[PDB]
Amino acid sequence: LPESFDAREQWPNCPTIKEIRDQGSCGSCWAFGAVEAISDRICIHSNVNVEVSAEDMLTCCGGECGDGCNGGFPSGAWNFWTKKGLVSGGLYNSHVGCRPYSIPPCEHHVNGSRPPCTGEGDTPKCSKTCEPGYSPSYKEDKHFGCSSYSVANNEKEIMAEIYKNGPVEGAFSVYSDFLLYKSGVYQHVSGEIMGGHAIRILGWGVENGTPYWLVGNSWNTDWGDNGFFKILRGQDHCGIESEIVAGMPCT
Ligand SMILES: *[C@]1(C(=O)N[C@H](C(=O)O)[C@@H](C)CC)O[C@@H]1C(=O)OCC
Numbered sequence: 001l002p003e004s005f006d007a008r009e010q011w012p013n014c015p016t017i018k019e020i021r022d023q024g025s026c027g028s029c030w031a032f033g034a035v036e037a038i039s040d041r042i043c044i045h046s047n048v049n050v051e052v053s054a055e056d057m058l059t060c061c062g063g064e065c066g067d068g069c070n071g072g073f074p075s076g077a078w079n080f081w082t083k084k085g086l087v088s089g090g091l092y093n094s095h096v097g098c099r100p101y102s103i104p105p106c107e108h109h110v111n112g113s114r115p116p117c118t119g120e121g122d123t124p125k126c127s128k129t130c131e132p133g134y135s136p137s138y139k140e141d142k143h144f145g146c147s148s149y150s151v152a153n154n155e156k157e158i159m160a161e162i163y164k165n166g167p168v169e170g171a172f173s174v175y176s177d178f179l180l181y182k183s184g185v186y187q188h189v190s191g192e193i194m195g196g197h198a199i200r201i202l203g204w205g206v207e208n209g210t211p212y213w214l215v216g217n218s219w220n221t222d223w224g225d226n227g228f229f230k231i232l233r234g235q236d237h238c239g240i241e242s243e244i245v246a247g248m249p250c251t
Pocket residue numbers: 023026027028029030031070071072073074171174194195196197198
């Protein structure tokens with residue numbers, strides 16, 4: 001395995017890999033980490049480009065994935081992709097795809113032109129229909145995964161998985177000092193626990209002698225490093241290597 005790897009550079013024909021979304025005022029990170037990596041993998045293993053609907057995952061999976069805007073289970077999300085499939089759907093107000101995200105973007109622990117994010121947000125309804133004007137039908141727009149698995153808490157195995165199959169979904173414990181991240185390799189030193197947070201791991205590298213994971217957050221582009229961040233790799237820091245999940249799309 002190489003010393004560094006950036007899925008964005010390795011798969012130039014898959015622009016979703018470079019995208020950063022906004023989960024809005026809803027605890028749907030579990031769904032976002034999933035549909036983002038799934039979008040990347042559909043492109044990587046089908047060379048078609050599809051903006052997988054965070055809305056479809058968030059609203060229609062149900063108990064198998066947890067509790068919607070109240071938090072969920074990453075592995076459960078990939079299971080939904082293999083069982084019921086996922087339709088397309090872009091950003092809020094984009095009118096792209098079958099079911100675009102219905103929760104407005106907001107400012108995540110930063111100042112900006114958007115309204116500040118609020119912790120309170122309700123899970124939208126599971127509507128098995130597409131926006132007006134879009135074709136095909138909801139049922140016909142479903143993209144299925146043909147496998148859903150969990151990668152071991154093993155740095156090398158995680159790197160190998162990304163290297164061969166593309167970005168994966170992961171999760172780590174968020175402490176308040178992470179909220180103000182701007183650059184460099186994040187290492188937890190202070191702050192109260194904020195809870196678990198699912199994200200998308202798309203690579204790795206070494207900065208100033210510190211090994212790290214290249215991660216895409218779902219708090220828009222004005223948070224962190226253009227929406228991305230780097231976190232210590234190899235020590236299961238904040239549990240970053242303890243909940244890796246992925247899967248492969250059907251042919
Ligand atoms: C992940 C989530 O969306 N968390 C919030 C966010 O704004 O990103 C806060 C609470 C984290 C600082 O409740 C979601 C989940 O499914 O967590 C378990 C992985």
